[PDB]
């Protein structure tokens, strides 16, 4: 009765964690956290973008359902290989 | 207490799962009434109460005598849906050929049991050999002393047809009832003497 899962598993990896170490220590000397050439966006804008996107509701074509029946068969066959 | 069961089936089933995709391919784009059949049954349940004649009972005994080749639980319910199908398709009287669809559904009911509780094939062998492993050591041992480290190292490996610990604990509770042994913890026991 669900569709998708995720995980937050921790594996030891040297290059990431020292970057993660600079990640958490950078927020203490200053007080600001932003970086990495991303212009921060106001949340009202995407809220209007969601609300405008919620007022579209497109209807699918025929080639899409033709492409998922072959997708489900390829979804059927490999899942019916493990059985473990 | 229930009459007939069924299980649904599943496989890879490539010609049918593709066909089942075609159903869900549809029903997204763009007499089967909603009340007319409902008033059709609610009239037809209490007004005409139909009959039963000899035309059913002659075939009815012809079914069970080959079926014996449960006892009567299956026999009581097998006429009721035979009656109701006669009550459904012909809202007047009894039918004589309504019983081939009665034996159609219940023959599919017993298809689910081809393969302990209602079965005794494992129970014609488990009580026998467990009645053997008592009499041997009780003819070797002058006492009735049987400790726990011996019985794991005697009966788990004489034969590999019995499970390890799922049924050996319940194996001894019936011997507790049948004047053989007693329980004294997860250790020493006390057995039967003459």
Swiss-Prot record, chain A:
Family affiliation: Belongs to the MCM family.
Motif position, Arginine finger: 1-3
Misc note: Present with 166 molecules/cell in log phase SD medium. Early fractionation of eukaryotic MCM proteins yielded a variety of dimeric, trimeric and tetrameric complexes with unclear biological significance. Specifically a MCM467 subcomplex is shown to have in vitro helicase activity which is inhibited by the MCM2 subunit. The MCM2-7 hexamer is the proposed physiological active complex.
Part of the full-length chain shown: 593 to 676 of 845
Described purpose of this protein according to its UniProt entry: Acts as a component of the MCM2-7 complex (MCM complex) which is the putative replicative helicase essential for 'once per cell cycle' DNA replication initiation and elongation in eukaryotic cells. Core component of CDC45-MCM-GINS (CMG) helicase, the molecular machine that unwinds template DNA during replication, and around which the replisome is built.
S-S bridge residues: none
Assembly, per entry: Component of the MCM2-7 complex. The complex forms a toroidal hexameric ring with the proposed subunit order MCM2-MCM6-MCM4-MCM7-MCM3-MCM5; loaded onto DNA, forms a head-head double hexamer. Interacts with CSM1 and MCM10.
Binding site for ATP 2: 1
Subcellular location: Cytoplasm; Nucleus
Name of this chain's protein: DNA replication licensing factor MCM7
Curated annotation (Swiss-Prot), chain B:
Stretch of the intact protein here: 701 to 929 of 933
Other remarks on this protein: Present with 8800 molecules/cell in log phase SD medium. Early fractionation of eukaryotic MCM proteins yielded a variety of dimeric, trimeric and tetrameric complexes with unclear biological significance. Specifically a MCM467 subcomplex is shown to have in vitro helicase activity which is inhibited by the MCM2 subunit. The MCM2-7 hexamer is the proposed physiological active complex.
Gene: MCM4
Species annotation: Saccharomyces cerevisiae (strain ATCC 204508 / S288c)
Family stated for the protein in its record: Belongs to the MCM family.
GO cellular component, one term: nucleoplasm
Any GO BP annotation: DNA replication initiation
Domain of life: Eukaryota
A single GO molecular function term of this UniProt record: helicase activity
Motif (Arginine finger): 1-3
Compartment(s): Nucleus
Name used for this protein in its record: DNA replication licensing factor MCM4
The protein's assembly and partners: Component of the MCM2-7 complex. The complex forms a toroidal hexameric ring with the proposed subunit order MCM2-MCM6-MCM4-MCM7-MCM3-MCM5; loaded onto DNA, forms a head-head double hexamer.
Alphabetic keyword roster: ATP-binding, Cell cycle, DNA replication, DNA-binding, Helicase, Hydrolase, Nucleotide-binding, Nucleus, Phosphoprotein
Function, as annotated: Acts as a component of the MCM2-7 complex (MCM complex) which is the putative replicative helicase essential for 'once per cell cycle' DNA replication initiation and elongation in eukaryotic cells. The active ATPase sites in the MCM2-7 ring are formed through the interaction surfaces of two neighboring subunits such that a critical structure of a conserved arginine finger motif is provided in trans relative to the ATP-binding site of the Walker A box of the adjacent subunit. The six ATPase active sites, however, are likely to contribute differentially to the complex helicase activity.
């Amino acid at each position: 009765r669900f569709d998708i899962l995720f995980l937050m598993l921790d594996i030891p990896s040297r290059d990431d964690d020292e970057k993660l170490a600079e990640h958490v220590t950078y927020v203490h000397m200053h007080n600001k956290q932003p970086d990495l050439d991303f212009t921060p966006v106001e949340p009202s804008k995407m809220r209007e973008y969601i609300a405008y996107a919620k007022t579209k509701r497109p209807v699918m074509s025929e080639a899409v359902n033709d492409y998922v029946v072959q997708a489900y068969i390829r979804l059927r066959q490999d899942s019916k290989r493990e059985m473990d | 207490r229930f009459d007939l069961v069924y299980l649904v089936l599943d496989k890879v089933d490539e010609k049918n799962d593709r066909e089942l995709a075609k159903h869900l391919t549809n029903l997204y784009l763009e007499v089967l009434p909603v009340e007319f059949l409902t008033m059709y049954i609610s009239y037809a349940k209490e007004h005409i109460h139909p009959i039963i004649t000899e035309a059913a009972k002659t075939e009815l005994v012809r079914a069970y005598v080959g079926m014996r080749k449960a006892t009567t639980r299956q026999l009581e319910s097998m006429i009721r849906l035979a009656e109701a199908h006669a009550k459904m398709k012909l809202k007047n009287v009894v039918e004589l050929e309504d019983v081939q669809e009665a034996v159609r559904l219940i023959r599919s009911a017993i298809k689910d049991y081809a393969t302990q509780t209602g079965k005794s094939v494992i129970q014609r062998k488990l009580q026998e050999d467990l009645s053997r492993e008592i009499m041997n050591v009780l003819k070797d041992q002058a006492s009735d002393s049987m400790s726990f480290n011996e019985l794991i190292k005697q009966i788990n490996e004489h034969s590999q047809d019995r499970v390890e610990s799922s049924d050996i604990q319940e194996a001894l509770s019936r011997l507790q009832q049948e004047d053989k042994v007693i329980v004294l913890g997860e250790g020493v026991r006390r057995s039967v003497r003459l």
